[model samples]
Target chain A: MIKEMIEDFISKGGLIFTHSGRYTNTNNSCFIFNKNDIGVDTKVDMYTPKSAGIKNEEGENLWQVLNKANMFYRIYSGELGEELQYLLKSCCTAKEDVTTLPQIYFKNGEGYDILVPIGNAHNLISGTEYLWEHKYYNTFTQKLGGSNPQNCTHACNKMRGGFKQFNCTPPQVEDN
Target chain B: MRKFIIVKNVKVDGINAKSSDITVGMPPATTFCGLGETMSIKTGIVVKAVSYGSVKFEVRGSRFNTPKPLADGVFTLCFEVEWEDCAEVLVDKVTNFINTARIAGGTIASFNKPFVKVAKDAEELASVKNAMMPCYVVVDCGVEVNIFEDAVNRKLQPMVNGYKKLEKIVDNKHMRDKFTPAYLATPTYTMIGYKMVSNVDNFDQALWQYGENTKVKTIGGIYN
Candidate 1:
């Protein structure tokens, strides 16, 4: 399953490429944010992953891990019809029709590096995922991975920049 | 059944900084009523559906200005709304195009006058049944420049005589399924705002305010 494959990949300490090359400077055109480079006005569901890289204890994504959780969301339009949608699809495994979406991301922000999904029954076990979702797209999709079990003050906002004055590099490369 | 929400706090503060002409940048007085220059502004209430024991509604609004050629009417401007509370409303950007009116060119001073509905099509009258209410209209079109002009016009009569009152839409229905936060729809309404004003404070400025189904009403889409 997609969840399992992701789970296995994350378990082995696999790293997801936010950009093409490792340590490469990025335009940050996409939502994938560096831990220190958070954007202007942002918020997150704080869905922390368990394995550090990206995986849940359930061995499946929230999409599958959801023997339940479906009843949690109220009405999440989340996506503001991103004009950048057609352009964003390239970096994701999303379908061609997938346009605007809400975000669900953060650094220090990954799946719960400390917890497990199986015996623990995530927060909505109350509201950790019950649906007050007020974020952007892409990140919202990341939640299906059953990883992020959290929230944040400001995740990687599409407008936020550490682009090194648009040089498009992470804080480090920019610092150097 | 509450039909629609009117924005009261909005000010028409104009470019000339005239407090009476509060709806900024709009035509300052009636001398330019038919003068046909070029001024445009747009504002609308963003409605999001909410429910508890009963479905109640709340609205937050955002306003914008567009590049207009200076006409005598208002046009719908897409508003991107964000709510402070946890609402069950559909959450999508531009899910609906709100009808915010702008003066094509003249002193109707749409200012932040907000909007009133139009009757562009027969089908519009159905989805919206209340017409006695001034803020409501039956049309695919949005608020008009001439119409919003009355919000704070010196020529238009105030509480004593002005545009029609809008009712709140009934928010009693609760959905059991498909409750994904999203934007729902853009409802229309009619505003019988002041026709024009040489000065505010003067109810005597009360120029052609709406007189139910008057000729001005036809121009603003009252009878459809």
Candidate 2:
């Protein structure tokens, strides 16, 4: 149903493209960007397995975990029709005021560390008129061999940054 | 010898006699009692079967000793009968009585009125442009049942019977298998539109109003 709907909608001049590896400064899963000249930009992500492995700290195989995440993303994005436009405006965090490049980070077995941009994180954040902006992330571990086998962690994070300021407010923890 | 008696109500010396008056066509040959004389008489009066017709009777009274005492106080009269048995006479008399005192006519107003006119000119215009208007047809097949009783008791019965017959016709396994759900579900609007176009002014406004009002009451508002 989702594929059919996407095909129909895209046939009518709507474009759906990937921005995950291009903009996130990471070489991981795939992310589709939704943008229309007259509408807001939204980022969508789907998970893929690095390899098959047993449990990592997260307690699931990379293939099994990310596959579920991909399924969920596809289902959710496909269901969004007119509502997607409204949700994009509400959730996007990219703004024109911030000049600093949005950094990508990962853990190196010891602690958290930043992965330097091999190339300019595609200036999804530069253009004044953005085609679309979306943010999605998934963390999962791959399972291997039989029971109690070695596992490796695989994850992807996406951030939509651009010249056009998003009218979104930061979440604040309030003391009740 | 047969005797006839003409019983008449009489009040003599403050005594009232309880009797009914009778008319005799044939006169009597003998009489044991005279007028104003007190007598006890048993007379057999034979009344022939009355013809199946209408009969009229009139009674008259007269005083002879008016303004003079030279004449005795006496009253004389004769009875007459008119028999009318023809069907025409009975019909005329009964009809006259009914018209004068019994019959009544009720005035019924037709609810049909032409409110909207879907012009064939519009269709013609659409045809020229190769465009089909989403408009519907209105057919005024005048008072389908001129009389309410006719529509309710006779005209609608055949239609209902036809539906029952259709159900019977389609009850066969082969027929049922051939019928598609989609066929049953197909929208009827197109057919109605066709009817409207073909009938052209064959519709009456009053009939339309009747149909509209009936649909509103029976099926709820038209929007659905």
Candidate 3:
């Protein structure tokens, strides 16, 4: 199972990246690795407020840094449309042929994060605008007081930063 | 049977709608509820709850006038309000009230005609699903058994719920009335109701109200 998952992830061009998770200096804090360089569960030293010595090896590769937190991938428009159709059909009791939709995928230790820009009529093809969501997992479940268990704020900011760097154009729906 | 006020193509601009995480999108559910609460005070009609459908918006600008426009946006939100009042009383004035309203800190730009309906059964409510077709309704997940898991499974986003009290509610010298209590609060990123510092006799009376030109004097829930 693990081997299959790793193989699939590699085909998607997934890589694990590291960040200092510092707010004061976001520029020099990120580092990226291929599957060969670091295993998915490899543990790295966490920077405490007092520690120092992290070098700013890469700059201008902000999206790579952003990709450290978020997993960015490109899918053909056909695949995306089908995925969206299946998603909407399962979650919502509606059926429609999806030609295209702008969506992003993010993952951390907690769980996977998926953002679909729902409202904007304009091209989300390259922009990360109007992607507002307002549900908090922990408290929303906590309200029940014993039923569910979980929750990120900065990773999204980094994801949007990644979007700008990539200029996420919409995939073509038709295959020639 | 309770009625639903379905407003279509409601347009607004300069709306600072965001999640607890501060991502720009549709206005939270409470915005409409507060608008309804404000309207109820004016016209005696009660808007119990609000749900929305078919949101289309764009982020025109953000926090500062920076290159990365993150915060501010303008959108048309289709509203489906759970209304409890006379249909005749609100049908004519609903549009007017909405026009003059501020939703989730956004000004009302424009909207299509507003109508009232008695959706006592699923059949009538089904019509709403059709009207807002080719668009998805923003469903409130709180009503679900496990809202967090449900939202995660559905790939829904996180939202600001309401204010969380930072301090105990107590009578302050700045209070408008002796009964009125004040406390420091912040957005829990979750609901609409404010938690009181202490219990009071009349819950309705304890409800916060906005008063004119009264900044320091009015003792109420303060969000920082």
TM-score of chain B of each: 0.17, 0.14, 0.62
Candidate 2 TM-score, C-alpha based: 0.13
Off by over 4 Å in 3: A1-176, B18-22, B61-89, B141-155, B169-179, B190-224
lDDT of 1 by residue, B89-156 (tens): 22221122112222222222332322222233544433222221122111112244422233223222
lDDT of 1 by residue, A1-176 (tens): 33343344434423221111111111111122122211221121112233232336664332232223331121112142332222222222211110121111101111101100010112111222222242211111111211122211011111122111000000110112
RMSD for each of the candidates: 23.8, 44.6, 20.0
- Give the local distance difference test score of model 3: 0.33
Off by over 4 Å in 2: A1-70, A77-176, B1-224
Fraction of native contacts (fnat) of each candidate: 0.00, 0.00, 0.00
TM-scores of the candidates are 0.15, 0.13, 0.41
Question: Per-residue alpha-carbon lDDT of model 2 for A24-133, expressed as tens digits?
Answer: 22232222232321112222322223223344455653222323434324433444455543332332221111112222222223222222121111122221122232
lDDT of 3 by residue, A11-67 (tens): 332322321111112222222222221232222212212221122355322222222
lDDT of 3 by residue, B1-224 (tens): 54656576666666653332223345554454456556665655655444443345544532233322222332223333455556666676677677888765666777767776565565555554344333333332232332233333544443444443223324333333333333332332321222221222221221222222111111223221
Q: Top model by TM-score, which number?
A: 3
